[PDB]
């Protein structure tokens, strides 16, 4: 058998006691990235379907929580994400703005206006 | 990530990854000789029939195994590197392939100190003078500082001559291959 | 803990436990779990042992203690089982007490070779006119019964079993047939009702019933046929005659497919593994007919298959047709129409049993077969005659349920039919004639039927007296 | 016992128990949850880890949450206080009428009655419906398949069966809705309240509803049939009576089982169904039997994928059915109710050895005459009504009278027919059809047989409409 | 050498040799069994382990059991002392008549003949069967193949060919029964003993029998075709004679492979078949050739799964045969027997330069008329045979007459039907089909040809029909 976190980098870190200076509770280091799926090491306090945020300004949804790693799906091109990046919790499941402030507005899947008519009013949010 | 220093010979597999982690950890800080000695020590320590019987049973919890191994490591005064390696192998449940790690590191350490395993095969044994000239010429084959590690097996299956392996280099002056070559030349 | 004769369940789940230990466990050996279940050690792997659990995996837990019994999978066999119902491992489930048997036979024992066997020379009487005259079944034969949902296959099996009583109540030890009924993946309600039906016909005193109903784990349904076949092989090898009825052999195929898929084996055609043909041939090659140097016993087999929408060229039907010595194609169209048993005599054949058929039945059924064959090809003068005679015969071969006939009554009825005595009787009244006619010969003229049965042929004097009887009766009907 | 969530892949949760493992099928409650989440164990992966299928949304779970081992499988409240109460698979009420107060709890994973706890004699369940009781009698403790399922009267027929069985034999009933649309679930709740089989006031209900919603994870829609079976098994065993168990739909039962099997990571079998299809169906269908104490008669609504009768799902369910009813759109058009297809309906016990020679002969005669009329209708449509003989116009008249008499007025449909519901016993039905077949009523008008109870009601209707 | 079992999965056993490893195909003996268990090596796994296929039941094998290398592949007894005997996979007699006393053993894994050994001669082998002789004429020294699903006539046809060809054969003959009924092998044995083809008390036996029937594991069925091939090869190469090699059923050789392939850890290919289907089939089937040292006229019965000729196994076998004979269930349902499909059956020697010009012209005329009838069949089935021109009605009548005439009564079926076996010399076949084609017999009834020898028997049958 084998695990994806058994790469020699993690074992190297843990052998010489370098795993105590890294906060493996609210941050993680990308083990793999490919075809829009990142496999992250750490994020031990991350909830299923919670949104994490990569160092390069991208977002992602953590879908697969396995014993070794977290499977995050990236909300954009995985061009900007590299192995070793830093992924931070956002703390909240994905939610979107709601209200009459959206009527007549074209928005994308996450409530961001894409019609260039200005910001989106948004008084209330909803999961 | 931490730019690990690669070993000379790349060992692959689970043992390869654990051994490469250990080698990278030791190479920085510089403790390769001491850690290799400690690895040889744990080679026998775990081999004890009681310890082996208590570590090959997957129904003793990993907690108990880690505690027993911590007690053994403290009782033997190891480097923190070897203690952490044993702890890591115990947590991941990779104890059943611990020797393969110690073996791997050995293969990984021998090349570090410069060694090129060699093999010589002949129909019958050799007189020590001829073995001495073999030593000399083979050391001629190697480079500078690369000690040699000769092995002289005896294969009567071949009908004479010699067969020599130096690393991946191979020279076959055995009567059997010459017989085969000439015979195949006839049939064509 | 003795890690040689005992191990600990590493991982349960799917009905395939992985055990750690049992270093001295033989392949295909039976082990016993702590809770009470039993398993068979399939995969002897370097580091563990794959034990298939003959029961519900709920009872097994990771950590439990597996102890090897020391013997290959075997079942209790003997005379002590007759009249008892038993699960797939030989443990009684009818609550009439412990089975109490002295001999144990392996379920995986190999079939007899080419020299022990001998051609099929004795008839296995089923008391079904259509089966007995048109597709006879010998002793030692393997005659597949293949049909659909509700078309009357279990009826054929149970009529056979109930009919064997004429012989199992007599004294001739060379005609007694001991029946075995293996029920696989079948409603337990049906099995209970069937057992009551047999008990009401005094047909349990010589019948074993092996149950692996739909609520029983897949390994039990996969193993029930082999337990039954060993229970029958006992009689076969002890010089007696047995008749095992697997019902169905397609539910066993489904159970084995489940077992294989849960083991992550490469699905083949219709997701069935590659061993299905081997699974069934291994089993149906044991229905042999030993020669007198080995006892002279026999073990008939009547596997049952349920086609799907009448598809006979499916995968499992074709395997078992390539394994068996004949067919009894029960057609759903005929069954719904009104013909029962709905045997499609056109497509149903018996390669082997043709030479085992009884002479008295042989001569009459020969002309019956020719007449029906001619009628089949025309469905003026000769055409009208063939239609009339064929319809008479077809209405003659209709039969009731749980009312098997002795060979002599079948001979009398078919003789009346084929010799044209009913060629004037209206086609609807034939049954009314039939059920009446039998009573007559079953009452006054027992001497004639007894003489036919004893002599084993319709002698010329027997022919003349039968002619007189039928014509005189038809005069007053 | 307490363990930790180690993994969460979709609706599958891997938990780790450092102390002692729970056996397979147990239920574990996740501690730290705003709403009760129950995980049913299904595997023992080794290293003290177990794999569980979740009965509710796993979103918001964290690798490490504490999970408490209940110690027994899903246990639901069973008793007389569940009658008229909706409750989901894990037994929590969902009708917002307070807790289901009971002194009994039953685990939903039980075993089929042993071989000796089995009735050896067939029976007949008299539902008080002419067509069902004549052309397709419902065996006691036997599965009945019910086809059609679209604006043909399935719900009204279900409610009428509930009412008759709770009025004739006095047994109660369970309605397990597997994969149930919430809109249709609420509509059914209200239809039951209106017709009267549920009573929110006086506690004289006759139905226990168990809804496994259509938006619950696959691990919940696969077990609601078992919750319904448990609620019915209480009444069978403990109360010692005959129960009805309506399973709507059974294809959704098999489909949810298939989804769970795929999620756990098992190779699909024939048409992409679970490799355990036959046993998954059998373990449930084998608990619907006639023990020596009571009995459970099940009525599965059945859906045939692609209209293919050989698809593994119906090919496997039909192996268990002991009868069949076929509501047809083509008969609700004629105003006949219940719109049961007299000819397509089937029964296993329609056998002279079981239902008796007189019942069998009457049923066979009615079927034959109806087939004759069906054949003659082509001649009428083509060659015109004149072409008939006089021994065929008579059969046409008799068949039309029989079709009218097979219709009945239900007690739960008095707001649709303006009449008063009739629960016709069996002897009345057999005598009525025997008389009609004999020709004793050839002088009456056809409409005198439409929507009446016994035959005497047809006589009275003829007198009232002719005079 | 000496190794120890380490794994025992199904019929695949892993054996670890610390000393010298055995080569591949090399046989091993499991030391400690009641009988002889031979393990044929198949792979080297590294770490000094070899995977092996067991030539017998593996039940009772204990991990750590001892295995002894034998140094050479499965070597079987070959010679003129294997005539009249019955052998199994490993050469052990199974007729209970004493050890096969030969002074020369042959390894069953020899290599195929090179290219400079093939013989290009192409003669015609007359079998006395009308359909086989006219449309798909078998050739002497070539490979032949009978394709057909279950119960269409493969074994009856092969027994007819045994009878005919191997009664008029002065050379030797070898029947290898791989994966067929054991009682069929017993019947064959006793038919030969009766027919004089085997002398239990002399040295004039001309048939060697090998048998790996269906009851044996997958490792014995796979490697029994090779045993038959070796027994035939000796009589070809060494004795320099002309051999007949009947096989039945060769599909079971590939099927058995797919049973062990799964356990050998190989990725399945098309329909669960081993990835090496065509290579194994080729290495088996290129040893059955007729070289310059002798001749083998091999007839192989090939089973078509689920009547699917698109299946990988028959589809791959088609490319290894000179003459085929696709037996068809559709034709067999019409009563035609042998059910040879005249349009699927082919042959290499159907060349006007080998069979003639009357034979070739008649065969092509028959095929053309049958193909025209096949083209019409779809319309005939719906619109009826009345919407046909007169030329088309003539074609239909001629084609039906020809279809019936291709049916023949075999002697081996005398027991089935009571008819009398018929042989039809080639000239009579050609003449009869010439006459039918020209229209000389358009006044006869088509059922006058059903199952007759030469055509004059058809005329006699028609005359009797007139009476
Ligand atoms: N000879 C017969 N005469 C009249 N009715 C019959 C006869 N044989 C069978 N039947 C009827 O057919 C029904 C089903 O019979 P049976 O159980 O033998 O079929 P089956 O194939 O075993 O059914 P299943 O496939 O559901 O097990 C019975 O209820 C019986 O009434
Ligand atoms: N016995 C009856 N009398 C009058 N109307 C009926 C009867 N049975 C069914 N119907 C009609 O059938 C329609 C569909 O009813 P129902 O079965 O409750 O819905 P669904 O078929 O969608 O479940 C109703 O509108 C009702 O008028
Ligand atoms: N020449 C023939 N004449 C009459 N019947 C035949 C003939 N050939 C085959 N059959 C029918 O086919 C059956 C034999 O099939 P067989 O060829 O032995 O099966 P398989 O194709 O599996 O070898 C017999 O029962 C018989 O009814
Ligand atoms: Mg049945
Ligand atoms: Mg055959």
Coordinates of C-alpha atoms and ligand atoms in Angstrom, one line a residue, chain C residues 148-155 306 335 340-341 399-401, chain D residues 348 351, ligand 1:
Chain C
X148 CA -39.3 -18.9 -17.5
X149 CA -41.0 -17.3 -14.5
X150 CA -44.1 -19.4 -13.5
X151 CA -44.2 -22.0 -16.2
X152 CA -44.2 -25.2 -14.1
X153 CA -40.7 -26.4 -13.6
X154 CA -40.8 -27.0 -9.8
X155 CA -44.0 -28.8 -10.7
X306 CA -35.0 -19.7 -15.6
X335 CA -48.5 -22.5 -20.3
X340 CA -49.8 -27.9 -18.9
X341 CA -47.1 -29.2 -18.6
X399 CA -52.0 -33.4 -17.0
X400 CA -53.1 -32.3 -13.6
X401 CA -50.8 -31.3 -10.7
Chain D
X348 CA -50.1 -17.1 -8.1
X351 CA -55.3 -22.2 -8.3
Ligands
LIG1 N1 -49.6 -29.4 -14.6 C1 -50.2 -28.3 -14.2 N2 -51.5 -28.1 -14.3 C2 -52.1 -27.0 -13.9 N3 -51.4 -25.9 -13.3 C3 -50.1 -26.0 -13.2 C4 -49.4 -27.2 -13.6 N4 -48.1 -27.0 -13.3 C5 -48.0 -25.8 -12.7 N5 -49.2 -25.2 -12.7 C6 -49.4 -23.8 -12.1 O1 -48.3 -23.0 -12.3 C7 -48.0 -22.2 -11.1 C8 -46.5 -22.1 -11.0 O2 -45.9 -23.5 -11.0 P1 -44.4 -23.7 -10.7 O3 -44.1 -23.2 -9.3 O4 -44.2 -25.2 -10.9 O5 -43.6 -22.9 -11.7 P2 -42.2 -22.3 -11.4 O6 -41.4 -22.1 -12.6 O7 -41.6 -23.3 -10.3 O8 -42.4 -20.9 -10.7 P3 -41.2 -20.0 -10.1 O9 -40.4 -19.8 -11.4 O10 -41.9 -18.8 -9.6 O11 -40.5 -20.8 -9.1 C9 -48.6 -23.0 -10.0 O12 -49.3 -22.1 -9.1 C10 -49.6 -23.9 -10.6 O13 -50.9 -23.6 -10.3

